[PDB]
Design an enzyme around this catalytic site. Structure first.
Site, PDB file in Angstrom:
ATOM      1  N   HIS A 135      76.472  32.614  89.569  1.00  0.00           N
ATOM      2  CA  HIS A 135      75.796  33.915  89.550  1.00  0.00           C
ATOM      3  C   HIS A 135      74.378  33.617  88.991  1.00  0.00           C
ATOM      4  O   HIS A 135      73.396  34.025  89.634  1.00  0.00           O
ATOM      5  CB  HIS A 135      76.655  34.569  88.544  1.00  0.00           C
ATOM      6  CG  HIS A 135      75.731  36.077  88.299  1.00  0.00           C
ATOM      7  ND1 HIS A 135      76.459  37.388  88.623  1.00  0.00           N
ATOM      8  CD2 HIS A 135      74.754  36.506  87.727  1.00  0.00           C
ATOM      9  CE1 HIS A 135      75.822  38.401  88.158  1.00  0.00           C
ATOM     10  NE2 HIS A 135      74.921  38.023  87.797  1.00  0.00           N
ATOM     11  N   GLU A 136      74.314  32.870  87.831  1.00  0.00           N
ATOM     12  CA  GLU A 136      72.810  32.656  87.455  1.00  0.00           C
ATOM     13  C   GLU A 136      72.105  31.810  88.363  1.00  0.00           C
ATOM     14  O   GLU A 136      70.950  32.062  88.221  1.00  0.00           O
ATOM     15  CB  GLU A 136      72.940  32.004  85.966  1.00  0.00           C
ATOM     16  CG  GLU A 136      73.872  32.913  85.154  1.00  0.00           C
ATOM     17  CD  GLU A 136      73.220  34.180  84.958  1.00  0.00           C
ATOM     18  OE1 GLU A 136      71.901  34.600  85.105  1.00  0.00           O
ATOM     19  OE2 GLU A 136      74.043  35.069  84.520  1.00  0.00           O
ATOM     20  N   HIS A 194      70.320  33.632  90.716  1.00  0.00           N
ATOM     21  CA  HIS A 194      69.146  34.382  90.297  1.00  0.00           C
ATOM     22  C   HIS A 194      67.599  33.549  90.166  1.00  0.00           C
ATOM     23  O   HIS A 194      66.462  33.902  89.968  1.00  0.00           O
ATOM     24  CB  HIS A 194      69.412  35.010  88.771  1.00  0.00           C
ATOM     25  CG  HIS A 194      70.117  36.208  88.444  1.00  0.00           C
ATOM     26  ND1 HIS A 194      69.812  37.400  89.640  1.00  0.00           N
ATOM     27  CD2 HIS A 194      70.875  36.472  87.904  1.00  0.00           C
ATOM     28  CE1 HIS A 194      70.875  38.225  89.116  1.00  0.00           C
ATOM     29  NE2 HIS A 194      71.520  37.939  88.115  1.00  0.00           N
ATOM     30  N   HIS A 207      70.828  42.863  91.674  1.00  0.00           N
ATOM     31  CA  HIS A 207      72.106  42.606  92.294  1.00  0.00           C
ATOM     32  C   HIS A 207      72.230  43.438  93.513  1.00  0.00           C
ATOM     33  O   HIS A 207      72.827  44.664  93.488  1.00  0.00           O
ATOM     34  CB  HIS A 207      73.105  43.049  91.184  1.00  0.00           C
ATOM     35  CG  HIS A 207      72.976  42.183  90.087  1.00  0.00           C
ATOM     36  ND1 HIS A 207      73.174  42.644  88.570  1.00  0.00           N
ATOM     37  CD2 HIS A 207      73.041  40.863  89.696  1.00  0.00           C
ATOM     38  CE1 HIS A 207      73.384  41.680  87.836  1.00  0.00           C
ATOM     39  NE2 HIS A 207      73.196  40.514  88.632  1.00  0.00           N
TER      40      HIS A 207
HETATM   41 ZN   LIG Z   1      72.853  38.819  87.214  1.00  0.00          ZN
END
Ligand SMILES: [Zn+2]
EC number: 3.4.24.-
Length: 128
Positions: free
Chosen positions: A95-96, A99, A105
């Site tokens: 998830h990170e 980014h 999102h």
């Molecule tokens: Zn996030």
């Protein structure tokens, strides 16, 4: 053993005042090692990968400045002594990493995260 270093992460750190910090350090280094191939494939770079343990219990990870620092929660939010499962932490790691590329999102984010999660499994299965 100390896990093989990931060329694409410059430094890892863990919370020094928490119980079993030696375990915690091995854990975040194993995360770093396990995602090394995926990061190479995606041209991802991270300067610092570090543990945090925020009062906000819904917080599991964070990405400061598109990979300058990624923070990961390693420990259960209702018991400092218990580490989260590796699968859970890896999920937050991916998830990170997403980014590094995408902030909001939105569809771009979720599409990419889905590709990373899928690919990371295959990488591990084949021991790449
Ligand atoms: Zn996030």
């Amino acid at each position: 053993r100390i896990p093989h270093k990931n060329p694409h992460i410059q430094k890892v750190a863990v919370l020094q005042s928490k119980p079993n910090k030696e375990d915690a350090l091995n854990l975040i280094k194993e995360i770093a090692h396990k995602v090394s191939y995926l990061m190479k494939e995606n041209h991802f770079k991270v300067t610092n990968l570090v543990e945090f343990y925020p009062r906000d219990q819904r917080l599991l990870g964070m990405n400061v400045n598109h990979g300058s620092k990624i923070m990961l929660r390693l420990r259960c939010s209702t018991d400092e002594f218990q580490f989260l499962p590796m699968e859970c932490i890896m999920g937050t790691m991916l998830h990170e990493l997403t980014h590094n590329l995408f902030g909001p999102h939105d569809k771009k984010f979720y599409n990419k995260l889905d590709e990373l999660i899928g690919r990371q499994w295959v990488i591990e299965q084949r021991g790449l």
